[PDB]
Amino acid sequence: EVETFAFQAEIAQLMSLIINTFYSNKEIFLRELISNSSDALDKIRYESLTDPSKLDSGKELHINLIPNKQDRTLTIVDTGIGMTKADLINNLGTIAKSGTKAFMEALQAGADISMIGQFGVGFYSAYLVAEKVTVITKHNDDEQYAWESSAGGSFTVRTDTGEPMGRGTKVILHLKEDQTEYLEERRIKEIVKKHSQFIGYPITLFVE
Amino acid sequence: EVETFAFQAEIAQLMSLIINTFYSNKEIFLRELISNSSDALDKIRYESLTDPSKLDSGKELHINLIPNKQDRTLTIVDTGIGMTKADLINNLGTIAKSGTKAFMEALQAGADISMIGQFGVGFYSAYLVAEKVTVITKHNDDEQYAWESSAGGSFTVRTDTGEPMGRGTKVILHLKEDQTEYLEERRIKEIVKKHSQFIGYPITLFVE
Numbered sequence A, B: 001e002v003e004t005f006a007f008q009a010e011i012a013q014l015m016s017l018i019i020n021t022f023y024s025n026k027e028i029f030l031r032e033l034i035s036n037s038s039d040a041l042d043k044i045r046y047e048s049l050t051d052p053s054k055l056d057s058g059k060e061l062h063i064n065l066i067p068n069k070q071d072r073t074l075t076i077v078d079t080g081i082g083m084t085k086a087d088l089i090n091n092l093g094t095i096a097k098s099g100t101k102a103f104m105e106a107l108q109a110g111a112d113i114s115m116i117g118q119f120g121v122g123f124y125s126a127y128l129v130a131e132k133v134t135v136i137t138k139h140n141d142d143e144q145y146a147w148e149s150s151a152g153g154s155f156t157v158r159t160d161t162g163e164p165m166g167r168g169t170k171v172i173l174h175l176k177e178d179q180t181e182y183l184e185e186r187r188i189k190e191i192v193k194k195h196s197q198f199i200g201y202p203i204t205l206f207v208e
């Protein structure tokens, strides 16, 4: 049922850095995730240009932000290309080993955490505000899976049997106790207007 | 031998905008191209993780900037994944129709040209300083081609028989008469230090 994997040593080191380094500008985590969703949404667009049947799993390309104060989660859903089990296991489709190399090296030469995404490892900025992150994903070439980690050197991957989503990725952020501002309508609007104003797909902020 | 294609109406409109709009900050064009090269270099890295034989066409991943004052060209070569003829014809691998949509719409709502790359059409910023742009490209799954355009609503694609490059892309900028500062060692250093300091691959500035 549940498979458990060790993070590579560098990712495990990146995550510990993210979690442990005092750094107040935690809000960038949302920009980095909406920017991954946009990327994943570009890819399915690009693919559907030459093969229109790639969109049979959903023709709408968009991003939804869904807070839930009862569960203490913020969830970014996109109808992008999604990831295959292989992609999930190989660091969620990213060049994360060499990306963390570059990033640590940049951190040496005068970069701050907010720059994480120029190394292609922006996803991990989720650990700025979340204590567990769950990624449900569905790519056309594969079944639906859920990747999950509370950091600590390991992640899990299982097949997901709850709500088929048809196509895309859902990043559920189980927020830290003291990071619940990110569940506020007003606070999320502010960050999307500030950091993600010019994204080429609709972003819908759901209400509770 | 030479095939000739019409730009889609929007790209042709984007290019005319780029060429015709007074906008002094022309130097961003280099950031946008080094950033495409980095992206193309990420992709071959990601692919080679699971299939190491993808690197048989070259194991070095890097970017070279090569001015030539005699020919009045600046050339950005990368050993990235390269593009197939299909990719070249379909707007150099980009979602350019909807990207230009997004960009024009952003330009409405208060964005400037320097933001072009957040819509995935940064390549065309080459027309800020170049009167012709030639792209030689080689992907593992295809032969070597040269795409070329002086704008004006059409591009050409031929197969390239000069210097096999093994794998990657070469963007040759035939610079405009009054844009030759971009051929100066000092000026290029300045722009790379300013806009592209934290790129995860070596950038080599060649000397004349």
Ligand SMILES: CCNC(=O)c1noc(-c2cc(C(C)C)c(O)cc2O)c1-c1ccc(CN2CCOCC2)cc1
Binding pocket: A032, A033, A034, A036, A037, A038, A039, A040, A041, A043, A078, A080, A081, A082, A083, A084, A087, A092, A093, A094, A095, A119, A120, A121, A122, A123, A135, A168, A169, A171, B042
């Ligand atoms: C290759 C086939 N699929 C995908 O690329 C894909 N589908 O869904 C993706 C999403 C991934 C993330 C995180 C988990 C990496 C999201 O937050 C949202 C997505 O939609 C997603 C994806 C999107 C972005 C990235 C990271 N980029 C960052 C810059 O380097 C290249 C890769 C990795 C994966």
Ligand SMILES: CCNC(=O)c1noc(-c2cc(C(C)C)c(O)cc2O)c1-c1ccc(CN2CCOCC2)cc1
Binding pocket: A042, B032, B033, B034, B036, B037, B038, B039, B040, B041, B043, B078, B080, B081, B082, B083, B084, B087, B092, B093, B094, B095, B119, B120, B121, B122, B123, B135, B168, B169, B171
């Ligand atoms: C899909 C298989 N190949 C590639 O993606 C590829 N190989 O070489 C690429 C380069 C492209 C450009 C311009 C011509 C688009 C470069 O300037 C440099 C490259 O190395 C290149 C490429 C790199 C970037 C882009 C544009 N990005 C921009 C953001 O949206 C997604 C696509 C398009 C193509």
